[PDB]
Amino acid sequence: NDHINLKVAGQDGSVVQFKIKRHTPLSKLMKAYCERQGLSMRQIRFRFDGQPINETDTPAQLEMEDEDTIDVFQQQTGG
Amino acid sequence: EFPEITEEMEKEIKNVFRNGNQDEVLSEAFRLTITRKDIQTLNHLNWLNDEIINFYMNMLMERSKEKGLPSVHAFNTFFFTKLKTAGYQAVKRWTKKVDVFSVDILLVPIHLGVHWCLAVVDFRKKNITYYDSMGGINNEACRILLQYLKQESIDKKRKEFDTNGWQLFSKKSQEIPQQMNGSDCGMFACKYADCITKDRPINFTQQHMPYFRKRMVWEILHRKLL
């Protein structure tokens, strides 16, 4: 059940490519994306097509195909 | 003339505020997650984080489809700006599997640096309206949205949008209520929308904000609006 490619784009405009088994949770990636290309974690959010992504979630069970892109934004606070 | 806050509520709420492991996951709905951290933003006069809004905007959307209420599709928070800054081509796919024209109202929660604000597409009224709780203007926001509609129409329905008759404007400083603190934007913004989605005219002022803060808490965890 082979690998697929995934683009993670920051709202600073930075694509970070990733290989992955299609059934594994996105915890592996989300924490790799924080460590490499250093970033908080408990201060961002991930969203495949405006749909939120929890660590639980897998690629297969989100219907992402190859080269599909994931959006990642800072946490947002305001008045 | 609003719901009372019972013994039950106070005791539950007060408990969730008292700090103790902010990672604790204490409400999972709409693929969203609400932690003690997320929920803390409602205490006293804190700054409403994104999670609380998205969640509330989801309940607002759920409480649509209720008989005799304008059907609402509410948007992501990160929507507005990702469009504003990166254009349509970016947010394009965000509305796959949802006809944005199937509903009566679209709900747009907006984050701008320091600020929470709201934009409301009302197909029935055929006008777009921006809502600052501090009466600040954003004529431009609407222009951007109307442009979205234009694009969306072509990308989904494969026809152009009927611009004709449509109004765009932000609401005056005294047309609606004003916030007297620095933190009650997301609070106005949320209650602003609630009020609307019920076709209810705006009732609430600053007065009712402390109460609405409490009440929102309950509404979140239990996933039910009052």
From Swiss-Prot, chain A:
Belongs to the ubiquitin family. SUMO subfamily. Changing residue 28 to E: Significantly impairs sumoylation of MTA1. Keywords: Acetylation, Host-virus interaction, Isopeptide bond, Nucleus, Ubl conjugation, Ubl conjugation pathway. Residues 2-79 form the Ubiquitin-like domain. Interacts with SAE2 and UBE2I. Interacts with ZNF451. Identified in a complex with ZNF451 and UBE2I/UBC9, where one ZNF451 interacts with one UBE2I/UBC9 and two SUMO2 chains, one bound to the UBE2I/UBC9 active site and the other to another region of the same UBE2I/UBC9 molecule. Covalently attached to a number of proteins. Interacts with PELP1. Interacts with USP25; the interaction sumoylates USP25. Interacts with SIMC1, CASP8AP2, RNF111 and SOBP (via SIM domains). Interacts with MTA1. Interacts with HINT1. (Microbial infection) Interacts with Epstein-barr virus BGLF4. There is a cross-link at residue 79 (Glycyl lysine isopeptide (Gly-Lys) (interchain with K-? in acceptor proteins)). The chain holds residues 15 to 93 of 95 of the full protein. This is Small ubiquitin-related modifier 2.
Curated annotation (Swiss-Prot), chain B:
Highly expressed in testis. Expressed at lower levels in thymus, pancreas, spleen, liver, ovary and small intestine. The lineage of its organism: Eukaryota, Metazoa, Chordata, Craniata, Vertebrata. Changing residue 185 to A/S: Abolishes SUMO2 processing and SUMO2 deconjugating activities. It comes from Homo sapiens (Human). Residues 32-195 are annotated as: Protease. This is Sentrin-specific protease 1. Interacts with RBM33; promoting ALKBH5 desumoylation and subsequent activation. The gene is SENP1. It is found in: Nucleus; Cytoplasm. Signal peptide: none annotated.
